[PDB]
Design a binder for this molecule. Structure first.
Ligand SMILES: [K+]
Ligand SMILES: [K+]
Ligand SMILES: [K+]
Ligand SMILES: [K+]
Ligand SMILES: [K+]
Ligand SMILES: [K+]
Ligand SMILES: [K+]
Ligand SMILES: [K+]
Ligand SMILES: [K+]
Ligand SMILES: [K+]
Ligand SMILES: [K+]
Ligand SMILES: [K+]
Ligand SMILES: [K+]
Ligand SMILES: [K+]
Ligand SMILES: [K+]
Ligand SMILES: [K+]
Ligand SMILES: [K+]
Ligand SMILES: [K+]
Ligand SMILES: [K+]
Ligand SMILES: [K+]
Ligand SMILES: [K+]
Ligand SMILES: [K+]
Ligand SMILES: [K+]
Ligand SMILES: [K+]
Ligand SMILES: [K+]
Ligand SMILES: [K+]
Ligand SMILES: [K+]
Ligand SMILES: [K+]
Ligand SMILES: [K+]
Ligand SMILES: [K+]
Ligand SMILES: [K+]
Ligand SMILES: [K+]
Ligand SMILES: [K+]
Ligand SMILES: [K+]
Ligand SMILES: [K+]
Ligand SMILES: [K+]
Ligand SMILES: [K+]
Ligand SMILES: [K+]
Ligand SMILES: [K+]
Ligand SMILES: [K+]
Ligand SMILES: [K+]
Ligand SMILES: [K+]
Ligand SMILES: [K+]
Ligand SMILES: [K+]
Ligand SMILES: [K+]
Ligand SMILES: [Mg+2]
Ligand SMILES: [Mg+2]
Ligand SMILES: [Mg+2]
Ligand SMILES: [Mg+2]
Ligand SMILES: [Mg+2]
Ligand SMILES: [Mg+2]
Ligand SMILES: [Mg+2]
Ligand SMILES: [Mg+2]
Ligand SMILES: [Mg+2]
Ligand SMILES: [Mg+2]
Ligand SMILES: [Mg+2]
Ligand SMILES: [Mg+2]
Ligand SMILES: [Mg+2]
Ligand SMILES: [Mg+2]
Ligand SMILES: [Mg+2]
Ligand SMILES: [Mg+2]
Ligand SMILES: [Mg+2]
Ligand SMILES: [Mg+2]
Lengths: 97, 66, 50, 87
RNA sequence: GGCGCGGCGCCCCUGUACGGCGAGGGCGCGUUCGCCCGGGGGGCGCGCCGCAGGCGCG
RNA sequence: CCCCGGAGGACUGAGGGGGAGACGGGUUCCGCGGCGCCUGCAUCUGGCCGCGGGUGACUCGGGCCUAAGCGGCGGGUGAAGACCGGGAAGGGGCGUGCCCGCCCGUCGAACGGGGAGCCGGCGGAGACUCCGGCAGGCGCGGGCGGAGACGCGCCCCCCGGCGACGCGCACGGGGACCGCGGCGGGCGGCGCCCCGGCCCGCGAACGCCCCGCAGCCCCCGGACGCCUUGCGCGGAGAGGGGGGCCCGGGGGCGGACCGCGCGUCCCCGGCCGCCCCUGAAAAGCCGGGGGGCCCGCGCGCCGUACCGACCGCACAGGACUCCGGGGUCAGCAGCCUCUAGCGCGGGAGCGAACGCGGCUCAGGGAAGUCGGCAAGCCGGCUCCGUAACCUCGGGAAAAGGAGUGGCUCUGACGGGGUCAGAACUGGAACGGACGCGGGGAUCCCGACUGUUUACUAGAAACACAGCGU
RNA sequence: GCCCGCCGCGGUGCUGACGCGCAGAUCGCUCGUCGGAGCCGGGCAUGGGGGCGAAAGACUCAUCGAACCGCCUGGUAGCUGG
């Protein structure tokens, strides 16, 4: 009933945080009977224990706004917060020329 | 670890400087374990054949492919 | 501290070693009613200065 | 903030264990004990504190040698040995 | 004082729903536009009905 | 059950309620068991209680060196306790007997100096320490080449070197990070669209070969040039042609998937600027001049668990330092977030006064009040336009105006964004949240930046450069 | 020893909260400063009629117009209580 030991042992083998380790709701009686990395390794084999993939952040909208910005969109005076020098330093342009 | 030319390899053999040789199949790697360094040679199997015809009987060679 | 001299280590070790209760067979043998060893200590409320 | 807040800046040891008297009284910076006076050759004793005197003195320890010598004198053969020597 | 729950209609509030089809500066893409459409959504007011509604003490 | 599991909904928001150290604590660590005490509610939870366990080093630190200091020194002084101190016949090599010699501390740094370590794995609790593999350090035993810059055994006296050092806006190079595509493998959803979403594609210390901008040096020869963002350099020998040395780095072979970019952090390089400020020492190791002469074995002692579990009588206080992703953006600001982590003396119902933290209010606009206290107005970016006075540096964002979204296009700079312009369009809207000066005319005091009554006084008080005795 | 502004360092106003506190000095909003007479950590030095002080009689371990601890000391009181 208390399965904090197996959760820490499982995240150790899978090399993941304890938040991304999932146990099959049934077959739980078995997880309770494990106390070693060896017994847990067999459970990750039978598939009773598994690790969820990380959930990154979709960049589809970001890639779209960048495409529009390379076309001249979202870049007028209402969208600029920093000054012209902070956005394009005068010395950088002089050195290039 | 370092790499070696075959004549220096035979110098090492002939003056008993190695403790074990390994053949690795893949161009074949010949791996020689001496006191100081591990020396490696790369030769085609045709040349491995003659190097082992010339292999030393005071010398344990072990094969390896997997 | 993780970086301690052997002398402080040994005096701390003795405090830990002697922080114990009276054996029950000792209570029976010596015919005691007081059964608490009042020289015990607990790390949360102690001020061992060793 | 001269009270409770100032109390939170304490992570130093002022005194440590004395090699002679064993108390938490040896000053780690002045290198001299405030209870028994070590490394002085003589012990720190003051007549304005007889309770301090009684706390650590002759008799609060084992008295092992003196105990044996006194019993030997009072009831054993020691004064006879003295007569044999002083002949 | 056998309540209410849940509907249906009226009446109000907001301001014309998604989608479909057919104008749009421009170079198959396209903000926006017109029609279906005073529409769609919502209700703590008004009117009429499936599930229901009258409890143990003293 | 507030414990455990699954599913959902949220939060902390990389200066973390994350991952780890120093100090302090001292067993709080781990496994099994439990609820008498504690866990201001409960508990089957637990840093609580019982029983067993637990921290492994040639290479990490301590031990050594010296800093600011502290102690010791024939003696000196004082009634003593004790305090003060160079003017003393002050020790070494060996091998007899010679020779050299002026006189302290194996005290003081777990951040300074200091020979030498990387990867993979295994456990309930330990790892740069174990195991396997691969190395490194310190020890002990069986006289030639070149034109040249340069290349290829010791011992004593003296001359030197390394160790060994400030701050700064820039500029340049490497590493890590981060992105955009391709290609391989796997997911998720899917009312319509979707080759448009998500996850994984890894390479150490060490050894050999090559390659390394700036910088310093050699040879020829003898001059209206070379060159940086900035400078700077040359008859005390530039440019051009050919070479040498250093370079915390990179590549190839060992050890053992493919391209292309802006930026961030860290270290390094050559310069330039600054000072009535000029930015430690020693052990240890080495060079010069003069003179005299491969194979084996080993590496002792101490720390190492865990914790903001520390101090405040137990606690919204106090408590040093590492590492630092994405989007918007000038950004280590605010707001949302991947990874990781998830307590905070307990819950339910009602929707009174009053209070505490907030919001909006017609018409007027300081009439309120000791007093505009409190609140509100202003605020980003671009363009326009800016007075008195002044120590000529300022005042200055003075005051005041106008624009700013989305979409479709066009031009300029050598793959990369910036800057400029036009048409169309939307309640007559656009820094749409967030972030973010209200302004002006004067009088008194003190020149200014700075300091202060820890806990009722931040000022006109103190300090200050300057001036004088 | 320039200006806006983050962490940091400080502490203006609300004479706000609290004031049988979260706390024997804290919390919220607002505010000063932010390359310097700047801020922080460890080691070391100065000892009570003495130290240290950009000076407030400030600070010297919740103690300061003279610290704390034990003793002289059951100090003396024409004064208050019993
Ligand atoms: K572009
Ligand atoms: K420890
Ligand atoms: K404690
Ligand atoms: K305080
Ligand atoms: K002392
Ligand atoms: K238990
Ligand atoms: K005398
Ligand atoms: K004296
Ligand atoms: K020492
Ligand atoms: K030292
Ligand atoms: K130090
Ligand atoms: K050290
Ligand atoms: K140094
Ligand atoms: K020389
Ligand atoms: K350890
Ligand atoms: K009520
Ligand atoms: K009332
Ligand atoms: K008024
Ligand atoms: K009035
Ligand atoms: K006001
Ligand atoms: K304005
Ligand atoms: K626009
Ligand atoms: K003043
Ligand atoms: K200033
Ligand atoms: K001032
Ligand atoms: K005051
Ligand atoms: K004040
Ligand atoms: K002030
Ligand atoms: K004033
Ligand atoms: K003052
Ligand atoms: K601030
Ligand atoms: K004040
Ligand atoms: K109030
Ligand atoms: K406060
Ligand atoms: K500033
Ligand atoms: K002094
Ligand atoms: K002092
Ligand atoms: K005093
Ligand atoms: K006193
Ligand atoms: K006393
Ligand atoms: K006395
Ligand atoms: K007295
Ligand atoms: K009197
Ligand atoms: K009196
Ligand atoms: K009385
Ligand atoms: Mg400029
Ligand atoms: Mg001290
Ligand atoms: Mg319509
Ligand atoms: Mg959040
Ligand atoms: Mg535990
Ligand atoms: Mg309770
Ligand atoms: Mg070392
Ligand atoms: Mg060190
Ligand atoms: Mg561990
Ligand atoms: Mg240094
Ligand atoms: Mg550890
Ligand atoms: Mg009035
Ligand atoms: Mg002033
Ligand atoms: Mg005050
Ligand atoms: Mg300034
Ligand atoms: Mg400022
Ligand atoms: Mg009396
Ligand atoms: Mg008295």
């Amino acid at each position: 009933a208390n399965l904090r030991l197996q959760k820490r042992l499982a995240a150790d083998v899978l090399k993941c945080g304890k938040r991304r380790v999932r146990f099959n709701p049934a077959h739980e009686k078995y997880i309770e009977q494990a106390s070693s990395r060896e017994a847990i390794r067999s459970l990750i084999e039978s598939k009773i224990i598994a690790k969820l993939d990380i959930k990154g952040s979709s960049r589809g909208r970001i890639r779209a706004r960048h495409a529009a910005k390379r076309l001249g969109r979202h870049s007028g005076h209402g969208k600029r917060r920093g000054t012209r020098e902070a956005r394009m330093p005068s010395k950088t342009l002089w050195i290039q020329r | 670890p370092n790499t070696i030319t075959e004549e220096n390899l035979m110098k090492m053999i002939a003056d008993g400087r190695g403790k074990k040789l390994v053949v690795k199949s893949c161009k074949v790697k010949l791996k020689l374990r001496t006191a100081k360094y591990l020396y490696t040679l790369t030769v085609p199997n045709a040349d491995d054949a003659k190097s082992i015809v010339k292999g030393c009987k005071d010398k344990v060679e072990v094969q390896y492919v997997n | 501290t993780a970086n301690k001299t052997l002398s402080r280590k040994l005096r701390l070790a003795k405090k830990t070693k002697t922080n114990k209760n009276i054996p029950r067979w000792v209570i029976a043998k010596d015919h005691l009613k007081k059964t608490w060893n009042y020289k015990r200590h607990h790390w949360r409320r102690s001020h061992l200065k060793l | 903030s001269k009270g409770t807040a100032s109390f939170g800046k304490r992570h130093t040891r002022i005194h440590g264990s004395c090699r002679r008297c064993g108390k938490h009284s040896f000053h780690l910076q002045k290198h001299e004990c405030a209870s028994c006076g070590y490394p002085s050759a003589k012990m720190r004793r003051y007549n304005w504190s007889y309770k301090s005197l009684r706390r650590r003195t002759q008799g609060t320890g084992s008295m092992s040698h003196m105990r044996k010598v006194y019993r030997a004198y009072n009831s054993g053969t020691l004064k006879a040995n003295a007569r044999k020597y002083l002949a």
